[PDB]
Design a binder for these strands. Structure first.
Lengths: 60, 60
DNA sequence: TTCCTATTGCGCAATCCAGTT
DNA sequence: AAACTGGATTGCGCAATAGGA
């Protein structure tokens, strides 16, 4: 059954390559969402800043 | 020389360990961040909402 | 148990990158 | 400039071992 070794390896080195490739991609995606969230975020910081300037104007 | 080689190996194996851990790292860091981000952004929309009604109402 | 794949840590070699001689 | 260092990164296979029919 050492006659299985190799065949099994390759069967493995391919499963590896796959897993990894997957991972890397899942990061990218995750990585990406960070930028999407940082977009929303500043959007809000500025927005809030705005409303604030507003009541600060209005009231005081 | 030989050990010449085996030591340059030793060296690299470590740079490799280090560098791989720093990446395991960054990869988490990001996870964490994608969280504080989701939370932050979210408590920020609720602040805009809150801050707004305070305006509709402080107007007429 | 029994097979397969999936995932992980690890080492080799080739590069890549800077700061050097 | 042009080869030269020496760590950092990265593609790649190996082996152990987690998982889930």
């Amino acid at each position: 059954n050492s006659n299985e070794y190799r065949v099994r390896r390759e069967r493995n080195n391919i499963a590896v390559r796959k897993s990894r490739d997957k991972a890397k991609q899942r990061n990218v995606e995750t990585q990406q969402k960070v930028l999407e969230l940082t977009s929303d975020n500043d959007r809000l910081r500025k927005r809030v800043e705005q409303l604030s300037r507003e009541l600060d104007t209005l009231r005081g």
